[PDB]
């Protein structure tokens, strides 16, 4: 059967012929209560203490208990299970190439990494997830070191020089849609470039980047106050009211595409894709494949980051203290196996339950290339040139950049839009809203005894009235 | 897109790696999440917690 | 009275998001339930349901 499946293209042998041969069998949950499974065919071998001699079925591979997102984790069995669950959550928020035809698509939010790499340390389940064709991360050189204190409490220290060379650089695509909706006989919204002589209800922003068809064109830099679609509605001097589509606040970008079509109702319909290049920045959330999420705490240049005797500076420095209570030994083994794979030229196998791969084998392999067997290296201080007394565990680890960028979350308010009903500030940074000074904040300020600060928050800074 | 090869999908500006399995409703890709119902036609006996029935059997 | 979240906008953030969303199951149980029994990793999920992939928080 294995020989016939080895030539699947030229025997027309497939999985269904295995099902027809009485070799494999579909077992469901009630039927699995009456079968006696062997984890491996090694269980079928007679033992000195024979556990069972009446096995009914055998597992094909136990690593098929994992799903799609847990099969990206290298060495999942060496990790604590909350970290496996966290990585299953955060591999869906990683940034890569989400689909091959991303240029045709007008998605509302899209994230595309500049240089996605396939992992050096893969599982064999990652071939059937097509992860080495649409990958979602970069193999960093990660030193797990205490350097300058800026990686403490889950943070990382990135290399500014690496980031300058395109390390984890990406683009954020945002698409805006607008249609000329015909609301009766009077309200006729039309894509016309607005002139102040005939249009009212503006946000007092320049319409000069718009073309004469009422839409902006690709290649134009845009800013948070600028106009990308000029729509004017005809009201029953100011006959027209400005209902122009504005860009999102504080979002620099360049118009990547403008698409003009007719919708199902026959109206004119447009979608504009704006492209913003996101360079990695302090506060951007980067994660490994072991639940070691964190934010970039600082960026040092190449001359500032510590270096090995070969002049290899890490791309990312993570804190040692992120490891012990987390118990992500799969991270350390992934760094070791990635060092071996990058020196050897292989792609390391990290399928969960594999006796052929163990830490001692990888250590001997790494020692065969003139490195210390446990992955440590003699790093030098980048500021003084002096050797660091400890030897730093450094190696290639697959980091992924998460969607949670700091510029998509930073918010501030002095004053602005208030709600219609209760005249309190608005909801969220998209509406220039305020933050909620909720009930537990009130309780904390009571326990502080700060009654005037409590009045300022709950009366003056929210909704004063007489 | 059924039965088309990868070249035929790329000529249609589609991705051959795109799995399918979703709908397009008003230009929005919608996935139907599978829902775990109780199995039908099977007698299930449970001890009701703090109820007038000590044991109940449903189908 | 209609159950919500049966149809969802397909996650297209990376390919792993797309595949995970296309292979997703849901227990129609209220997410405010303080009982842990439907949330537990039951023994019978072996090989059918991923033991690691689940949301954090209320679900």
């Amino acid at each position: 059967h294995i020989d016939q499946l080895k030539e699947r293209e030229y025997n027309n042998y497939s999985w269904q012929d295995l099902v027809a041969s009485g070799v494999v069998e579909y077992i469901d949950t009630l039927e699995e209560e009456t079968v006696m499974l062997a984890m491996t065919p090694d269980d079928l071998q007679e033992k000195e203490v024979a556990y069972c001699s009446t096995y009914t079925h055998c597992e094909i591979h136990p690593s098929m208990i994992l799903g799609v997102c847990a099969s990206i984790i290298p060495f999942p069995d060496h990790n604590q299970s909350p970290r496996n669950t966290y990585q299953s959550a955060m591999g869906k928020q990683a940034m890569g190439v989400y689909i091959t035809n991303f240029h045709v698509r007008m998605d509302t939010l899209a994230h595309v990494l500049y240089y996605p790499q396939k992992p050096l340390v893969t599982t064999r389940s990652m071939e059937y997830l097509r992860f080495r064709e649409l990958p979602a991360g970069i193999n960093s050189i990660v030193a797990i070191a205490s350097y300058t204190g800026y990686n403490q409490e889950d943070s990382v220290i990135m290399n500014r020089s690496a980031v300058d060379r395109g390390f984890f650089r990406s683009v954020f695509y945002r698409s805006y849609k607008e249609q000329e909706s015909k609301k009766g006989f009077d309200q006729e919204e039309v894509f016309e470039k607005p002139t102040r002589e005939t249009c009212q209800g503006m946000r007092h922003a320049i319409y000069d980047k718009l073309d004469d068809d009422g839409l902006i064109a690709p290649g134009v830099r845009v800013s948070g106050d600028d106009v990308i679609i000029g729509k004017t509605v005809t009201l029953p001097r100011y006959t027209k009211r400005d209902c122009s589509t504005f860009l999102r606040t504080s979002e620099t970008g360049i118009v990547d595409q403008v698409m003009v079509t007719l919708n199902q109702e026959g109206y004119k319909f447009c979608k504009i894709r704006v492209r913003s290049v996101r360079i990695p920045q302090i506060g951007d959330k980067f994660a490994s494949r072991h639940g070691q999420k964190g934010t970039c705490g600082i960026q040092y240049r190449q001359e500032d980051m510590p270096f090995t005797c070969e002049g290899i500076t890490p791309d990312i420095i993570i804190n040692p203290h992120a490891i012990p209570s987390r118990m992500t030994i799969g991270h350390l083994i992934e760094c070791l196996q990635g060092k071996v794979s990058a020196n050897k030229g292989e792609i390391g196998d990290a399928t969960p339950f594999n006796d052929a791969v163990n830490v001692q084998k990888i250590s001997n392999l790494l020692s065969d290339y003139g490195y210390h067997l446990r992955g440590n290296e003699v790093l030098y201080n980048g500021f003084t040139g002096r050797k660091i007394t400890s030897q730093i565990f450094i190696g290639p680890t697959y980091y992924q950049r998460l969607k949670h960028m700091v510029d998509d979350k930073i918010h501030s308010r002095a004053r602005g839009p208030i709600q219609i009903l209760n005249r309190q500030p608005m909801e969220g940074r998209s509406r220039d809203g305020g933050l909620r000074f909720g009930e537990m904040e009130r309780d904390c300020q009571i326990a502080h005894g700060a009654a005037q600060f409590l009045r300022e928050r709950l009366f003056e800074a929210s909704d004063p009235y007489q | 897109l059924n039965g088309l090869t990868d070249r035929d999908l790329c000529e249609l500006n589609e991705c051959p790696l795109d799995p399918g399995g979703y709908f397009i409703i008003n230009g929005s890709e919608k996935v139907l999440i599978a829902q775990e119902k109780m199995a039908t036609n099977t007698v299930y006996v449970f001890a009701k917690k703090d109820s007038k029935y000590a044991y109940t059997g449903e189908c | 009275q209609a159950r919500a979240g049966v149809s969802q906008v397909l996650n297209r953030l990376t390919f792993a998001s797309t595949l995970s969303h296309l292979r997703r199951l849901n227990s129609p149980i209220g997410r405010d339930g303080k009982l842990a029994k439907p949330r537990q990793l039951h023994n019978t999920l072996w090989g059918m349901v991923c033991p690691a992939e689940t949301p954090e928080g209320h679900a």
Binding site: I2, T40, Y128 | - | L19
Partner: peptide
């Protein structure tokens, strides 16, 4: 011929590759 243990990893990943060549990942939908 029984699959000897030195060939078993290759054999099980070949039959798994056959399963994922035919069925795929979104086959249930």
């Amino acid at each position: 011929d029984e699959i000897t243990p030195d060939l078993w990893q290759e054999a099980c990943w070949i039959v798994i590759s056959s399963y994922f060549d035919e069925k795929g990942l979104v086959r249930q939908q």
